[PDB]
């Protein structure tokens, strides 16, 4: 699992963190930010938006070549089943990879998909290929973000750090606009849980508040499912839409946008 040294995906994934990387810029993530922070793209409901993701795969993953909808079920499932008496945690694993509609749209994956590291300071070593990946990012060119905190101040906290652009930002941004009823934690885990430099590598706790550390357990909880209930073996969809229906129609029901 999660696996970098090998693997038979590992051509197509180091290619897209090395172009991620060398183009998650601050300026890049602050123009994204706008494209999407309006959600005027699309209205949808949630199980539209999933059957979206029935028509696409995800380039980043060494772990899945299967459409990234059955993912989707496949981590709510295993949520479900390890946390019965929290059913908005079961939902957090049917939506947390929705943003991902964006490479639908024309979106280069590389700003879709992905492990996330905050732009506007220096990378750090848990950073998937941060040695051999990072040489052509302008950024670094500039004293202004080329430093450990670059443009941040000690534990500004997370929710003050600009991270490279993809569907966890894009996700927990539109469930606020769209005033889903799920706990705070619930958006802090989807905000976040593409940040594998945190939350498993240990680093940029330099940026981190004593809100964030508190919230290291939750993020990780919900990491462990994410991570490991990929398989080839894919659920009966078709089955388990009633269910999860039931929870949307609790959290975030009707057409959102998008
Ligand atoms: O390849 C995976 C996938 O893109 C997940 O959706 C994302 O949350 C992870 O950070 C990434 O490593
Ligand atoms: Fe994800
Ligand atoms: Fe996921
Ligand atoms: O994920």
Redesign the pocket.
Request: hydrophobic residues 5%; negative net charge.
């Given at each position: 699992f999660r696996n970098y040294t090998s693997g038979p995906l590992l051509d197509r994934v180091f290619t897209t963190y090395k172009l991620m990387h060398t183009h998650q810029t601050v300026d890049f993530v602050s123009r994204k930010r706008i494209q999407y922070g309006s959600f005027s793209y699309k209205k949808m409901t949630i199980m539209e938006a999933v059957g979206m993701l029935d028509d696409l795969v995800?380039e980043?993953?060494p772990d899945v070549d299967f459409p990234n909808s059955f993912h989707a079920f496949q981590t709510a499932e295993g949520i479900r089943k390890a946390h019965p008496d929290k059913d908005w945690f079961h939902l957090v694993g049917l939506l947390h990879?929705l943003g991902?509609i964006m490479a639908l749209w024309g979106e280069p994956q590389w700003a879709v998909?992905?492990?996330?590291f905050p732009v506007g300071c220096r990378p750090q070593a848990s950073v998937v290929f941060c040695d051999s990946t990072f040489q052509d990012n302008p950024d670094l060119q500039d004293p202004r973000y080329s430093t450990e905190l670059g443009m941040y101040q000690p534990h500004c906290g997370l929710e003050n750090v600009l991270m490279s652009w993809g569907?966890?930002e894009y996700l927990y941004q539109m469930m606020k606009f769209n005033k889903f009823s799920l706990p705070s934690e619930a958006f802090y885990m989807i905000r976040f849980?593409?940040f594998?430099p945190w939350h498993t590598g240990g680093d940029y706790r330099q940026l981190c508040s004593q809100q964030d550390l508190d919230m290291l357990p939750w993020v990780q909880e919900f990491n462990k499912f994410?991570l490991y209930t990929k398989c080839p073996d894919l659920p009966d969809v078709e089955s388990l839409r009633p269910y999860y229906q039931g929870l949307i129609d609790k959290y975030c029901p009707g057409t959102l946008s998008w």
């Open positions: 995800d980043s993953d990879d991902k998909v992905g492990d996330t569907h966890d849980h593409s594998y994410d």
